Every structure is written in structure tokens, then in C-alpha cells.
Amino acid sequence: QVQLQESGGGLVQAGGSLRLSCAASESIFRMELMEWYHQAPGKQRELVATINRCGSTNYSDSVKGRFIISSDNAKNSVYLQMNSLKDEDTAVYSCHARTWTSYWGRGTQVTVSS
Amino acid sequence: QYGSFCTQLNRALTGIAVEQDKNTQEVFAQVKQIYKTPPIKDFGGFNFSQILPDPSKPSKRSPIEDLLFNKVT
Amino acid sequence: GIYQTSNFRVQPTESIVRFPNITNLCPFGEVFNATRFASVYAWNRKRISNCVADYSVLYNSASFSTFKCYGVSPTKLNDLCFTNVYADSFVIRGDEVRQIAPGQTGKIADYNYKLPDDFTGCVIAWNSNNLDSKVGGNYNYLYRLFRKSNLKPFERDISTEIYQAGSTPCNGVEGFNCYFPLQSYGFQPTNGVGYQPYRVVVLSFELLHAPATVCGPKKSTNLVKNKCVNFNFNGLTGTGVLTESNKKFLPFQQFGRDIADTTDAVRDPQTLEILDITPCSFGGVSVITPGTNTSNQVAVLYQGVNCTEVPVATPTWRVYSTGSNVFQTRAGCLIGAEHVNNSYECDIPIGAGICASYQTSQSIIAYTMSLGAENSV
Amino acid sequence: QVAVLYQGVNCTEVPVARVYSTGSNVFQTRAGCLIGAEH
Amino acid sequence: QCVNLTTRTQLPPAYTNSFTRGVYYPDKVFRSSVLHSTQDLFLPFFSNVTWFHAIHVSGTNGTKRFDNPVLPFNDGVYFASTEKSNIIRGWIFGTTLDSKTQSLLIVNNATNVVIKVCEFQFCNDPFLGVYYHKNNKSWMESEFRVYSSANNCTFEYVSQPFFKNLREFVFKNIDGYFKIYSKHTPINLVRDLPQGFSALEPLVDLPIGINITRFQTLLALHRSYLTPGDSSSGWTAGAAAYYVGYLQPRTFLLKYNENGTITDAVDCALDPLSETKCTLKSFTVEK
Amino acid sequence: VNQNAQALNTLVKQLSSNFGAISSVLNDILSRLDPPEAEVQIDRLITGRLQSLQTYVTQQLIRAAEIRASANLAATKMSECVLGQSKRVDFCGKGYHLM
Amino acid sequence: VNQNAQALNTLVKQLSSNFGAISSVLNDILSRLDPPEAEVQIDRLITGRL
Ligand SMILES: *[C@@H]1O[C@H](CO)[C@@H](O[C@@H]2O[C@H](CO)[C@@H](O)[C@H](O)[C@H]2NC(C)=O)[C@H](O)[C@H]1NC(C)=O
Ligand SMILES: *[C@@H]1O[C@H](CO)[C@@H](O)[C@H](O)[C@H]1NC(C)=O
Ligand SMILES: *[C@@H]1O[C@H](CO)[C@@H](O)[C@H](O)[C@H]1NC(C)=O
Ligand SMILES: *[C@@H]1O[C@H](CO)[C@@H](O)[C@H](O)[C@H]1NC(C)=O
Ligand SMILES: *[C@@H]1O[C@H](CO)[C@@H](O)[C@H](O)[C@H]1NC(C)=O
Ligand SMILES: *[C@@H]1O[C@H](CO)[C@@H](O)[C@H](O)[C@H]1NC(C)=O
Ligand SMILES: *[C@@H]1O[C@H](CO)[C@@H](O)[C@H](O)[C@H]1NC(C)=O
Ligand SMILES: *[C@@H]1O[C@H](CO)[C@@H](O)[C@H](O)[C@H]1NC(C)=O
Ligand SMILES: *[C@@H]1O[C@H](CO)[C@@H](O)[C@H](O)[C@H]1NC(C)=O
Ligand SMILES: *[C@@H]1O[C@H](CO)[C@@H](O)[C@H](O)[C@H]1NC(C)=O
Ligand SMILES: *[C@@H]1O[C@H](CO)[C@@H](O)[C@H](O)[C@H]1NC(C)=O
């Protein structure tokens, strides 16, 4: 089984609403760190939002005000809602986790039409 | 009833104890006399205060000796 | 040369006893004098606590056929203390009295009373022919003869379901391969001695690290401090010097261990005070001597010990021995040698820069070793 | 972060052998199976 | 006697963690400045602990219920309660919780806490009625609606009559002995137990010697059963709560301070780093 | 230093094992039982403690031999590299030795 | 020379101990007991001497 699978990618016009949802088989709670990475074409990977085990939440400067990362403790996963989409937000999104060894997921290529 | 099994253990430990002091004596007692540097430090510009004894400290040690002594717990 | 001859140790000058404040009498008469004893499968349970118990009376009462004990000699039982006592009783034939002992297999042993292999305690059995036997037969005592599996140690089985010996389900109805769960005992005086009624009582002790409640008959002594004394606190014994310790014991704590095999601290049972435990004293004895060719006077060294206590450390070359200068050194105290200011090359090493030699009030003299003649370039 | 090393075993029985958590950089060496480090 | 509950509704159970929570002194001894490894039933680090709201609120308007299901008792239960109005008032233990077999009753009351070991006849919904505002004046009036009949009261203990707070409890039933470990700690703004480290000391050892398999909880019925009042019958709409944990056989490395109080410990069987720490008998490992 | 300390500590820790007996403390066995089984337990305790002592002594002897070899090398270095000028390369530090 | 001689002497001296057995002489034990417990005694002696 894929220990962490991501879902929610696709095409969308600018200014829409979207919710990236990546779920992991293991408990999201002993994992101690959830994070999201998206890489623009021709650019390096960058961090989007991090949520530690304690509950501290951080967002990148181009992420504040619109993107909010959340994790419901009913179905073990982490949620990330996008809104007011702009064209350079188009990238390949991947959510990262690290209990004591790096884990990675694939897919979720978002395109912003403008 | 186990005989004299104790005596050899005591003897071996005593032998190790003597061997340690023998090692120290052999490795350091290499000079039959004691010398002292003259109070004048005129050595053509060569400085040895780092390795020479320091009378100021309570233990007559060089600063390097102090560092090494404090390092090992 | 210098020779290690033997070792010394301070002898314990006193023995003290401190036991709890309980002054109740344990009810052995109830358990042993009960007119009616339980069945084998069910037996009975009666905890005993918060009382003094005299086991000597039970031992020498001579009214018990068997008095075997496991894990403890019956004679010393008065000395020991326990947290609590569990007492169980039932009736068993004379033949089956053997099956009580642990590590043994038997119908009673496997289906009625299983004892743990590491069981501590004693079992008391004596005939009850004139009590539990009737002319018409005492059938009130039940016999379990078939069970699905062997019972766990110290486990009571009361279910009276009809076990299915064959494939047919009994469904609570007797018949083929369905038998009565608890057979009866044919207790009649006509039966033989091996079939005579025997009343069996088993006593199990709990030697656990907890406050005791069933301490035997003993008297509490007084606390003497700052001396080598044999101590016996709540059953645990030892020998050492006890002082006032500042360790903040928690209210649920009793003992104190730092290296996991020494009880360095303990709490008095009567007065809830904490006191540390230290071994009295010990050390090796070494004899300093020149060759017998030279002379016969010798000097002794008590290694690694304060020599304030060495007079109290038959040969007994101490006490009255005052020497001339019983002076402490890092190795200990030197007896029979004279301290000298003049320094010489070492010949008889002692330790920490102290050297002794024989030369012309005592013949043997000690001094600080000289590294050699001084020079100056 | 730490990396575990199994001595002299093929990187095939290590899953059925602190969960392994499936195949994530299961790089195999002569010393054995190495887990949690990139080559 | 026992009265029924009217509105039930449902809400999916929630979860939370118990990171470094629920550690108790294994034995009764003193140590100092020495780390020591033990082996006893502990709550595993980072465990999924179930969450129950004392008031099962369907809507903050006043639709309420009690979240008091019967729960298993498997080799121990970790119990803790954060609250502000003493909603929790006791628990019942046993196998079938009926008059057939003996059961243990331990209940806190507006007068005194009571401990009984009898063959009670428990109803489906045992509770403690509260009439805080039911009468004309504002005063505390309780109600006993736990069981119907009690028989064979083998053991009895009673006490003398008498800003969220956590009250951790650890129960363990071995060798016919019941063990209780507790601790009090002030706290604030904690929807879930906060993180940290605390030690649970023993409270009482108690020789019931019966069989326990399942257990439930006793709550304070702040409302009435016929017609409580306007609305918001439960206090603070289910803010009062408690959590359940299950201890498992593990191996821990306790560290004692100079004062003899346990300060930190590790779980030898959680991650390879902790395994290394346990093997090396230290809290720090070099390259 | 650490190896010596750890060996000593391990030797001390061996005092708490049972070696198949019923209690690791001698005094309790003596105070609990009679001679005819007291010796039955004490023999096992004695065997275990003796064999642990034997292991410790052997390990200490080997360590002492190694330390003696190191000390002999140090003494030769003292004699040659310090009291004079030695032509042996890499014996008194990398490069040509001066003092 | 003294160390070698003393070690040999200590070795030969150990033959007189009992190691918890009845006696330190094989023949006397063999000459007085039947095999079932003679085996036990020889077992103790073998352990000690080994
Ligand atoms: C030898 O070296 C020492 C330093 O290793 C010199 O001591 C220094 O002296 C200056 C001025 O006299 C001070 O400012 C420094 O703080 C001193 N350093 C130390 C470590 O004490 C010393 O003067 C030198 N002597 C000669 C003759 O060169
Ligand atoms: C742990 O709790 C989460 C709730 O956040 C739940 O989704 C998950 O199924 C639980 N896992 C286990 C093993 O109980
Ligand atoms: C019990 O202790 C109290 C005070 O500690 C003492 O007065 C009393 O005499 C003790 N009981 C007995 C029987 O000595
Ligand atoms: C039973 O009680 C009597 C007197 O009450 C006593 O003399 C007798 O010793 C008791 N039985 C036993 C076995 O001790
Ligand atoms: C031992 O004593 C004898 C007799 O006094 C003497 O001849 C001999 O020289 C002595 N040995 C030494 C080493 O002084
Ligand atoms: C032990 O000897 C020291 C001297 O180093 C002395 O100060 C101390 O009082 C002595 N203690 C006792 C109990 O005699
Ligand atoms: C050595 O001389 C000093 C005086 O300088 C004196 O105090 C001390 O007692 C003397 N010691 C001996 C052993 O003669
Ligand atoms: C592991 O198994 C594969 C299966 O074919 C084999 O090719 C490979 O050589 C094996 N590795 C080792 C180290 O035996
Ligand atoms: C190293 O380079 C080779 C190409 O020369 C490539 O096939 C291989 O995958 C590289 N190794 C890694 C770990 O990227
Ligand atoms: C419990 O009490 C009832 C009567 O209240 C009685 O019938 C029953 O036998 C008793 N059982 C026990 C075990 O005491
Ligand atoms: C506890 O009760 C259960 C019935 O729910 C039973 O199966 C089990 O054997 C009992 N345990 C003991 C130790 O009697």
C-alpha cells in the first residue's frame, strides 16, 4: 500500500476554490510533522505549509490569507484548501511527512487558467 | 571446600597493582637529578611560558597541564 | 618488603529489633476449629492481617498429622513477618493428601487445587474421622472428576455445567458421555484409613516489599545510632552504622537503593523516621618489615581507613597498643613507625609519596620520598 | 533522524522480518539492507 | 431508583493523543539521580486515546445526551478527566454488572465518596441527578439513581462528609488486588489533555479479589429527566469530558532526579532511536 | 577510565541475580530456611558469584597486559624522541624530527 | 622460575579439595557407593577439577 497518497489535483481557472487532500495509512498523530511541497516548472521545490504535532501552524508569505492547512481526526489525513487562485500557483503539489524517515507522495498537478 | 581458589585471584590482582607502579616508574624516572631553568628567559626570542611550570598557580603546572587535567574527568 | 597478610572489620557491638505496633491476635482458632469445611472444588478463602500470630502453638499442638512446609522452615516462622496471610480449607481423603504439594500431577492437583511451582507457605492436614465422617455417610463434600483443562494455580472453579465427553452436546442434560459435574464423597467410618476424612488447611504467605501486618511474637528494642549495630527492621536484617538522612522519602516509600543491590536507607516501623545505612568498616592489613636477617620489629598499616576506630578494629595487638605516632596517611594509619622530616630515596613503598626504611624511637621510620639530589645549571 | 541496517539479508524478507512502512529507499548493499538513506 | 433518558442522538467518537502521559511509580522505593529501567503495564507513548464528551451535545442550543457507554477493561485502563464543575462522580467495575455476580462500586457524592463491593442490580442508565437550579434557590442538591438492589456487600469504605483541572487515574487488577494511581494538576484552554510530563503516585491498594472485564462511568445529571428547563441543560455544552486509554506490556527507562521524583522516561519499543537509548542506558547518543 | 569504571559497575551489578536460587540476598535465605536446604541454595549462589569473579579477573589481566605494552612504547618514546635526536621517520611525529 | 613452580604446586595442591562431595579420593567413593549416587559425587569432582 502507498503509505501516503495525495488527491485533489487538476485544472482550474484563476480565483477558484480547491482542497488538496492527501491521506496516510499510518496515524497522522505519531507522525509528528505534516508539510506540503509544490515545485514550479523550471523552479526549485518550496515549502507551502507546515503543521507540527503540537499544533503550531506556519504558512509561506505567498500562502497567508488564502491557503489554510488542516487535519481532521476522523479519517486520518491532512487538508489544504486553496482559494483566490492565481496563475503562478500552478505547480506540482506534494505533501511531506517525517516520523523518523522521509516520506513522499505523487500527483496533484494543479493548473491555474488565466 | 573449594580449596585455595581465592589465593590466586588475590595474587593476580596484587600483581596488576604492582605492575601499574612499575610502568609509571619506568616511563618517568629517567633522570637521576632535578634541574631548574634560570630565572632569566633570554632565549633569543624563544618563548616557553606555555610549557614551563607556572609558580603562580597553586599546583606547579604548565597551562597545558591545567587544560589536560580539566579535560579528563 | 611489604606483604598483604589478612583483612579486618569492625565487629557489630549490638543487635536491635524494631517491629510494628500491632497488638492483635490472629484468628487461627476460627479457621482450624470450624465445624464445617468446604468442598474440594470450591474450598474457602480467609485473609489474615493486622494481628500477631504464634506459630509455635500450632507447630507443637501435635494434633495435626502433617506439617510440611515449603520455602520456609517452620521453626523460624515466629521471627519472620509478612504483608498478609491467606488461609484455605477443605476435606480430602488420606490417599490424596500427597497431591497438594506443587509440581505434582493428580486429579485433585489438576482439577481442584493447583499449586504454583514457586509456592511459599505450608499445608496442614489432619484426620477428621470423628468429625467429618457419618455412619450413613457425609455426602455434602463434592468431587470434581472431569474438566476441560487443568486449572491455573490458586484458581476456584464453581461452574456446574455438564461436560461433554463425546461429540454429542449435553446441552445441560445428562446422558451418554454426560456426567454429574461434582461427584459425592463416601465418608463413612467403615471406610479405610486412606479413605478416612482429613481436613486440609493451606497457608500462603506474601513476602512482598510492603508494610507487614502479621508479624510474629517479638519485642521492639531502642534505636542506637552512630555505631556498628545489627538491625532487624520489619523482618529485613543487616549490620551497619545508621545516621540521620536528609533524603525526602515519599509517603508511599519504605526503602532506598542507589546501586540497586544496597538498601542504603530505611524507615523505622514505629516512628516514621528515615535513616541511612552504611557498612561499619573494613580493610586489608599489611605488615611493613625489613628482612628477618636484619631485625624482628615490624609496623602494621591499616589501608584506607580512619584510625580513630582502629583501637576497636587472642592476638589482639590493638586497643592497649598506643604506639608513638598513630598518624593518618592517604593510605590509612601507620602504627609502629616514626615520622621523619629528612627525605631519602624510597626502598619500601607505601603510597602517596610515603616511604619507610629500617635504620638507626621505633626502628622503622617513615618519610616523604625524595625524587633525587637537586641541581642547577 | 536515524537509519537502520540489517546484517547480511536480502532486501526482500525485510518487510516481513517500529514498522518498515513499505518500500521507501530500500537501497541494498553488500553489508545488508540499508533503510532510510539515499545513495 | 433508575429513570430513563429521553434524547439520545449520535455523534461520531473523537480521538486525541496522550504524548508522554500516564507514568506511575512501579515499586515503593527511593532512588536519586539514577536512571533505571523497569518493565510493567504502561500507556504506550503517542497512543490513540478515545474521547467522550460528558454531555453528548447534538447542538449548542440545548439538545444534549450523556456519553456513557460500557467499555472493556483489558489489562488496565488509563482514565483522566478535565472539567470545571465536578461532572464525574465515580465508576462501576465488573463483568456483567448485574446482581448475578459481585461488582465494585466507587462513587463520589455531594457528601462523601463511597466504596462498596456488592451484587448491585445496575440499570441501563445509572447516573447522579443534580438539581443545581431546579429548585427556587441556587444550591447543590444531588440524587442517587445508580442501581436498584444491592446484595452481598463484601467490602465497604466511606469517606468523611464534605479553571479546568486534570485528574488522571490508572486502574490495574492483578493478584486479586486493585491499584489506584492519581494526580491533580491545574490547567486552562485545553480542549484535549495538554502535553508535558507528570508522575502518578499510588493512592490505595485494595484487596477485592474479584473478576473485572468491563466498566462504565458515573456522571452528574445537571438537568432533570422529565423537563429540565429552558435549554442548555448540559454545562458548557459538553465541555466536560474524559478520555480512555489501554495499557500494554512495554519496557521503560525511568530517570529519577536528586529529589527522587521521576522526571523523564523513554519508550524502549517505539522507534530505533529509543531502542538505542535503552541499550546504551543513556538519554544522549553520539555518532 | 570509562572501561575500567564500566567493568567495575558490571561486577557490582552481578550481585542481584539468582543463579537459579530462590532469592539473590544471602541473609534472607539464611534467616528463612534450615541448613539442609540453606546449603542447597548457597552452593548455587557461590558458584555463580565465583564464576563472575573469574571472568572479571581474566578480563582485567588482559587489559593490564595491553596497558603495559602501551607503557613500554611510551617509555621508548621518552628515551629516544626527547633525550636526543632520532632519525627514525614518523616515530616522533610527521616530518623530520627536531626535538 | 618461581612463578612457574608456584603455579604447578598450586595446581597439584587442588587435588585434595572436596568441591562439596563426600571425599576427595575417587577410589574410596567408588569402593563405597553404587553407581546411582557415585555418579553425582564424580560429577561434582569433575566440575571442580575442570
Ligand atoms: C610568552 O608568551 C606569553 C603568552 O603565551 C606572553 O604573555 C602575554 O604577555 C602580554 C604582555 O606582556 C599579555 O598582554 C598577554 O595577556 C600575555 N598572555 C598570557 C597567556 O599570559 C609573554 O609575555 C611571552 N614572553 C616572552 C618573553 O615573549
Ligand atoms: C487513530 O485515531 C484516528 C483519529 O484521528 C483514526 O482515524 C484512526 O483510525 C485511529 N487508528 C487506530 C489504529 O486506532
Ligand atoms: C503504639 O504507638 C503509640 C505512639 O506511637 C504508643 O503510645 C503505644 O504505646 C504503641 N502501642 C503499644 C502496644 O506499645
Ligand atoms: C478449639 O477451641 C478450643 C477452645 O475454644 C481449644 O482448646 C482448641 O485448641 C481449639 N482447637 C484447636 C485445633 O486448636
Ligand atoms: C643473613 O644473616 C647471615 C648471618 O648473620 C649473614 O651472614 C648474611 O650476610 C645475611 N644476609 C644478608 C643478605 O645480609
Ligand atoms: C576521620 O579522619 C579525618 C581526618 O582526615 C577527621 O577529620 C575526621 O574527624 C575523622 N572521623 C572520625 C569519625 O573520626
Ligand atoms: C618537620 O619540621 C617542622 C618544622 O618546620 C615540624 O613542624 C614538623 O613536626 C617536623 N616533622 C617531622 C616528622 O620531624
Ligand atoms: C536477492 O534475491 C535476488 C532474487 O533473484 C537475487 O537476484 C539477489 O542476488 C539476491 N541478493 C543477495 C545478496 O543474495
Ligand atoms: C550515478 O550516475 C549513473 C550514471 O553514470 C546513474 O545511472 C546512477 O543512477 C547515478 N546514481 C545515483 C545514486 O543517482
Ligand atoms: C447474597 O445475598 C443473597 C440474599 O440477599 C443470598 O441469597 C445469596 O446466597 C448471597 N450470596 C453470597 C455469595 O453471599
Ligand atoms: C472473568 O469473567 C469472564 C466472563 O466475562 C470469564 O470468562 C473469565 O474466566 C473470568 N476471569 C477469571 C480470572 O475468573
Author numbering:
A (entry chain E): 1 to 114
B (entry chain A): 755 to 827
C (entry chain D): 311 to 623, 630 to 676, 689 to 705
D (entry chain A): 607 to 623, 634 to 655
E (entry chain A): 14 to 175, 186 to 310
F (entry chain A): 952 to 1050
G (entry chain D): 952 to 1001
Please share excerpts from the published article on this structure.
The spike protein of SARS-CoV-2 mediates viral entry into host cells. The spike on the surface of mature virus particles is in the “pre-fusion” state. It is a homotrimer, consisting of three receptor-binding S1 subunits on top of a trimeric membrane-fusion S2 stalk. S1 contains a receptor-binding domain (RBD), an N-terminal domain (NTD), and two subdomains SD1 and SD2. Here, we used nanobodies (single-domain antibodies) as probes to investigate a unique epitope on the SARS-CoV-2 spike protein, located outside the protein’s receptor-binding domain.
Here prototypic spike refers to the spike protein from the original SARS-CoV-2 variant plus an additional D614G mutation. We determined the cryo-EM structures of prototypic spike complexed with either Nanosota-5 or Nanosota-6. The structures revealed that Nanosota-5 binds to the NTD and SD2 from the same spike protomer, whereas Nanosota-6 binds to the NTD and SD1 from two different spike protomer. The epitopes of Nanosota-5 and -6 are both located outside the RBD and do not overlap with the ACE2-binding region. Additionally, the distance between two Nanosota-5 epitopes on the prototypic trimeric spike is 143 Å, suggesting that Nanosota-5-Fc cannot bind two spike protomers in the same trimeric spike simultaneously. Interestingly, Nanosota-5-Fc at a wide concentration range and Nanosota-6-Fc at lower concentrations significantly enhanced SARS-CoV-2 pseudovirus entry. Thus, the Nanosota-5 epitope not only enhances the cell entry of prototypic SARS-CoV-2 pseudoviruses, but also enhances the cell infection of live prototypic SARS-CoV-2.
